[PDB]
Amino acid sequence: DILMTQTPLYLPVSLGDQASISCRSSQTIVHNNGNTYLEWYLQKPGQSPQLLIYKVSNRFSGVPDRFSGSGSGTDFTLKISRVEAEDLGIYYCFQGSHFPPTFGGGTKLEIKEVQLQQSGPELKKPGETVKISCKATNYAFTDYSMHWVKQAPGGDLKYVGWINTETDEPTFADDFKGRFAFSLDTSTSTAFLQINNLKNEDTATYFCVRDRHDYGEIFTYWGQGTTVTVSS
Amino acid sequence: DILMTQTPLYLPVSLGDQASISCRSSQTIVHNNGNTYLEWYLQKPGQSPQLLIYKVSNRFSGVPDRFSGSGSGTDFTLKISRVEAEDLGIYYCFQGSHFPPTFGGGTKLEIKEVQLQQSGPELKKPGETVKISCKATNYAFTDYSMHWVKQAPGGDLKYVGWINTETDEPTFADDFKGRFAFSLDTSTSTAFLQINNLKNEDTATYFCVRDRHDYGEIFTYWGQGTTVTVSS
Amino acid sequence: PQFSLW
Amino acid sequence: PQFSLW
């Protein structure tokens, strides 16, 4: 419902240069609790997205100060004072203030203990079913919910839903109401996402994600992802 | 029709190791002009293929010398003297000697100013119609043709065809004689690919590509790609 | 804690 | 130059 319009789609740059990326929300994203859950993620080639900035301008632990986030209202910006080799990849802005949370389309930048382990890539024929698993390590599984995110072939990110790990109650984003189901197994500290009747539009990498919302962070720990290829 | 068969399918290695990939074509691939257009590409997840080797054994610009290409007739080999992290991804061989140009199926290497900007991701539904755009900057748009390549869910790459940017004449590959139309808006140095009445199988990633054939290089510059998602 | 923001 | 190979 809340569109995050991210520009530019592409940012060719030479190391040493500055880079600025902007994001405009279709609606304000202040939460009734006063916080603005606007986050910025970096996805390096062959890796899962990683959190860089949360609540608009706070740098995630370990993120270098070359990265700074700013903005308010409907306009936000991530600035990289000097681009280095490890900064190349795709950047995404994200709003987690109003359900369903939404991601910007991404900006490809290029030169001119908690762990979540997911099941392996699956090649499936349409109409079939797949059950993706996500095993939580280093925290008590039922202390935090488990979230699920879909990354389509072209890289766009879409929220699937979350499952309360204590009540076993799931919640889906409108676009995933019907053929998707969440379940869990506490004996194995594992959360599952099941997809019924595999369709072409389901081909993607699905990520399970752990939040630290009580610290002000929405998507802090990402699984390595599970690619589901529907070879019709 | 030419089949490009690569060996192995997956190539697990430790960093710093040597790696070798084989590629066999179902026929000899020498062009009537005497040249053998056998190329090698590397594609990182979510990025576009990048040209490594052309004319069998010549390194493309910017490609480090740990990469070497060799072979003849129907047996071709890509060698990497020392594998480094930036080298991981899927490698595809390719022949452009005989139309339609074909791509090998790929080999995944894993651990144990010309610019083309395409239109964002397209969330569609069957029947809908989509117009993918590709803005070519930093060169005389009418100087060179514009090629289009389709990448299927399983990563299979297929040539769609090309359009003469001066004469505006499109040339298609038998599998795209249908609902596929090439057009251009030279006033913005843009080439378009048209797909009407979308279907489930149209969900793929479409890349516009610039050749540098007068250099013996086939697909030298690739746009970042446009994935056409169809909610079938 | 279980997710409580929405 | 426009594509002259095929």
- Determine the residue type at B81: S
Query: Which burial class, exposed, middle or buried, applies to B143 when counting CB atoms under 10 A from its CB (0-12, 13-18, 19+)?
Result: exposed
B192-220 in b/e form (b: 16+ CB < 10 A) is bbebeebeeebbbbbbbbbbbbeebbbbb
What distance in Å separates the CA atoms of residue B121 and residue A92, rounded to the nearest whole number? 14
- Chains B and A contact (Cβ–Cβ under 8 Å for 3 or more pairs): yes
Looking at chain D, which residue has its C-alpha nearest residue B34?
D5
List domains and CATH numbers for chain B. Answer: 1-113 (2.60.40.10), 114-212 (2.60.40.10)
Q: Tell me the C-alpha to C-alpha distance, in Å, between residue B194 and each of A14, B114, B232.
A: 34, 23, 19
CB-CB neighbours of A159 under 10 Å:
22
Q: Tell me the C-alpha to C-alpha distance, in Å, between residue A8 and each of A215, B44, B119, B207.
A: 30, 21, 11, 19
What distance in Å separates the CA atoms of residue A13 and residue B17, rounded to the nearest whole number? 31
Q: Which residue has the tokens 């740990």?
A: B66
Closest CA to B76 of B151, B35, B22, B30: B22
Q: Both tokens of residue B69? A: 């290409």
Looking at chain C, which residue has its C-alpha nearest residue A165?
C2
Give B-chain residues touching A46 at CB under 8 angstroms: 44-45, 88-89
Contact A230 B117 (CB under 8 A): no
CB-CB neighbours of C1 under 10 Å:
11
Q: How far is B51 from chain A (nearest CA, A)?
A: 15
Among candidates A108, A152, A200 on the partner chain, residue whose Cβ is nearest the Cβ of B200: A200
| Gyration radius from chain D CA atoms | 5
What distance in Å separates the CA atoms of residue B144 and residue B211, rounded to the nearest whole number? 7
Interface test with D, best of B1, B184, B208, B211 (most D CBs within 10 A): B211
Give A-chain residues touching B154 at CB under 8 angstroms: 123, 229, 231
What distance in Å separates the CA atoms of residue A148 and residue A208, rounded to the nearest whole number? 5
Which is it for strands B50-54 and B58-59: parallel, antiparallel or unpaired? antiparallel
String of DSSP letters for B75-126: EEEEEESS--GGG-EEEEEEE-SSSSPEE---EEEEE---EEEE---EEE-T
| Residue B95 near residue B38, CB atoms below 8 Å | yes
- Chains D and A contact (Cβ–Cβ under 8 Å for 3 or more pairs): no
Closest CA to A127 of A229, A232, A204: A232
Q: Is B2 on the interface with D (CB under 8 A)?
A: no
| Residue A2 near residue A94, CB atoms below 8 Å | no
Contact D2 B171 (CB under 8 A): no
What end-to-end distance do the CA atoms of chain A give, in Å?
31
SS3 B186: helix
Give A-chain residues touching B232 at CB under 8 angstroms: 199-201
Which is it for strands B89-95 and B102-103: parallel, antiparallel or unpaired? antiparallel
CB-CB neighbours of B8 under 10 Å:
12
Closest CA to A39 of A6, A16, A9: A6
Q: Tell me the C-alpha to C-alpha distance, in Å, between residue B132 and each of A100, B135, B173, B207.
A: 28, 10, 18, 9
Q: Both tokens of residue A16? A: 């040493």
Q: A168 — alpha (psi -120 to 50), left (phi > 0) or beta?
A: left
- Determine the residue type at B178: G
Beta bridge partners of A180: A195
CA torsion, ordered A111, A21, A105, A145, to nearest 10 deg: 110
What distance in Å separates the CA atoms of residue B111 and residue B230, rounded to the nearest whole number? 34
Interface test with C, best of A213, A217, A219, A221 (most C CBs within 10 A): A213
Q: Both tokens of residue B215? A: 């250099």
Contact A147 C6 (CB under 8 A): no
What distance in Å separates the CA atoms of residue B58 and residue A5, rounded to the nearest whole number? 42
Contact A96 C5 (CB under 8 A): yes
Looking at chain A, which residue has its C-alpha nearest residue C4?
A213
| E-state strands within A27-142 | 38-43, 50-54, 58-59, 67-72, 75-80, 89-95, 102-103, 107-111, 115-118, 122-124, 130-137
Give D-chain residues touching B164 at CB under 8 angstroms: 2-3
